[PDB]
Amino acid sequence: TSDVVTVVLGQDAKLPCFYRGDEQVGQVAWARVAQELALLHSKYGLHVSPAYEGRVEQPPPPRNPLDGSVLLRNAVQADEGEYECRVSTFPAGSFQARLRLRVLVPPLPSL
Amino acid sequence: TSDVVTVVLGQDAKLPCFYRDSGEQVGQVAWARVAQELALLHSKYGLHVSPAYEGRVEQPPPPRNPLDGSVLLRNAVQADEGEYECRVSTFPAGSFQARLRLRVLVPPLPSL
Numbered sequence: 001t002s003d004v005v006t007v008v009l010g011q012d013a014k015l016p017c018f019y020r021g022d023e024q025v026g027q028v029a030w031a032r033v034a035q036e037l038a039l040l041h042s043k044y045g046l047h048v049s050p051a052y053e054g055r056v057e058q059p060p061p062p063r064n065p066l067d068g069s070v071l072l073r074n075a076v077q078a079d080e081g082e083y084e085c086r087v088s089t090f091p092a093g094s095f096q097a098r099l100r101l102r103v104l105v106p107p108l109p110s111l
Numbered sequence: 112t113s114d115v116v117t118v119v120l121g122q123d124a125k126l127p128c129f130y131r132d133s134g135e136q137v138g139q140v141a142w143a144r145v146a147q148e149l150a151l152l153h154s155k156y157g158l159h160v161s162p163a164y165e166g167r168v169e170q171p172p173p174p175r176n177p178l179d180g181s182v183l184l185r186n187a188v189q190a191d192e193g194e195y196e197c198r199v200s201t202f203p204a205g206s207f208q209a210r211l212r213l214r215v216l217v218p219p220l221p222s223l
Binding site: 102 | 118119218
């Protein structure tokens with residue numbers, strides 16, 4: 001996993017957040033670095049900010065109980081910045097993974 | 112087929128080749144650079160790939176359309192950027208040529 005994600009404008013960007021351990025995962029919250037983006041619940045599955053409706057997907061099943069990675073669909077310029085996943089872990093562990101999201105605009109055509 | 116494909120440097124690029132009426136069946140779909148051959152989606156014989164491109168070309172996850180001659184080019188580099196053509200041999204005599212451009216984007220230096 002790389003800490004910086006760069007995508008072309010309008011394509012979908014994966015925000016990877018997978019945990020190495022010895023404890024299993026409870027909830028993985030996703031946010032921009034102050035305002036909620038999504039929630040991958042252990043018991044309850046995926047919850048998404050209405051502001052991000054239809055824009056948040058998980059990876060295709062069968063899947064990992066400890067992969068908290070999400071896909072942000074159809075990237076725009078407004079989307080770029082840094083993002084934190086907060087992983088509530090057992091027993092008291094908290095892991096926050098921050099990554100930077102880069103959205104690239106193509107240059108003018110030659111043709 | 113989409114006429115311009117844009118990708119980030121180091122990424123995989125989908126190179127679309129969809130064939131458009133009734134009784135036509137697609138046989139072979141060849142892929143090349145303008146002059147170097149890249150691959151061949153053969154009806155009997157399956158995917159064949161140029162030596163210059165080992166490990167970098169896949170078909171799309173199945174089930175896929177017999178009239179979809181699209182491939183995946185793994186790991187985009189600057190050299191890939193350029194023009195690409197797909198040629199669709201169809202039953203009985205139908206032929207379709209799709210040309211498209213590949214744009215490979217380099218990220219600017221970080222601010223943060």
